[PDB]
Amino acid sequence: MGLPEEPSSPQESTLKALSLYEAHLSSYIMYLQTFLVKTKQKVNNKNYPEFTLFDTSKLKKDQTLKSIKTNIAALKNHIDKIKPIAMQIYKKYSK
Amino acid sequence: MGLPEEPSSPQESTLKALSLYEAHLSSYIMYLQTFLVKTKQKVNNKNYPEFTLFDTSKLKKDQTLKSIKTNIAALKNHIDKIKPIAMQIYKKYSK
Numbered sequence: 001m002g003l004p005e006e007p008s009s010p011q012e013s014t015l016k017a018l019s020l021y022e023a024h025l026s027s028y029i030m031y032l033q034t035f036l037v038k039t040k041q042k043v044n045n046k047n048y049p050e051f052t053l054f055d056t057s058k059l060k061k062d063q064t065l066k067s068i069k070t071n072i073a074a075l076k077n078h079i080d081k082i083k084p085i086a087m088q089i090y091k092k093y094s095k
Numbered sequence: 096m097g098l099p100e101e102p103s104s105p106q107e108s109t110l111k112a113l114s115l116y117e118a119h120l121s122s123y124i125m126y127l128q129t130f131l132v133k134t135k136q137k138v139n140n141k142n143y144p145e146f147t148l149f150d151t152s153k154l155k156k157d158q159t160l161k162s163i164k165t166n167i168a169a170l171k172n173h174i175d176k177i178k179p180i181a182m183q184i185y186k187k188y189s190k
Contacts, residue, residue, distance in 0.1 A: 004099040004126070020189055023133040027126040031099070034125040038118040042158065063137065094115055 003090050004031055006079060018068045025075035029054050032079075032086040039089045049085050054078050098185050099126055101174060113163045120170035124149050127174075127181040134184045144180050149173050 007024035010017035033053060040048050058074050060067030102119035105112035128148060135143050153169050155162030 001100060001103055005096060008096055016188070019137050023130055023137070026133050027129040030129040031122040031126040034122040035118055038121050041156075042114050042118070061136075093111070 003035065003086060004028065006083065015065050015068070018065065018072065019063075022068055022071050022075065025072065025079065029075060029078055029082070032082050035086055036082065036089060039093055043093060049089070051082050051085050052078065098130065098181060099123065101178065110160050110163070113160065113167065114158075117163055117166050117170065120167065120174065124170060124173055124177070127177050130181055131177065131184060134188055138188060144184070146177050146180050147173065 007021060007028055010021055033051070036051050054075075059071050102116060102123055105116055128146070131146050149170075154166050
């Protein structure tokens with residue numbers, strides 16, 4: 001069924017909507033990172049693209065609506081780095 | 096968009112079809128595990144269900160069609176342990 005879709009942002013900016021969205025984004029990053037690491041293992045030519053592993057030290061741990069919104073930003077910025085690479089490696093190796 | 100769907104098994108039992116399926120299954124497990132760990136952090140009542148973290152030492156590293164098929168089995172057995180828990184925690188906390 002191909003790679004999973006990036007989670008969609010809730011309409012509702014409630015603590016629970018945003019907390020769930022943070023969890024999905026973290027989970028989606030881990031799917032993409034795992035896919036990139038496992039695909040590197042199977043075809044490990046020196047050409048294999050370079051990716052940042054997400055640094056969880058950039059995530060606030062305190063459950064504030066403010067800290068959740070800040071984490072969402074950090075996760076979205078990381079997705080923008082790795083999603084295009086994941087999608088290119090998926091195509092390269094499903095060819 | 097809810098939790099992602101478990102990857103579907105290819106029709107084709109080719110090395111490439113099975114290797115890609117192994118990568119998706121590993122990636123899907125990491126999505127579910129991350130979702131379970133992040134959801135435990137947000138609601139950490141003593142009731143929170145108990146899950147096995149996947150042991151990558153149970154995975155063969157040698158790219159044999161035989162070793163890939165064996166890894167697929169191990170990953171599918173782990174999904175059967177954690178998918179129902181992930182789906183229940185998703186509902187509990189999207190309530």
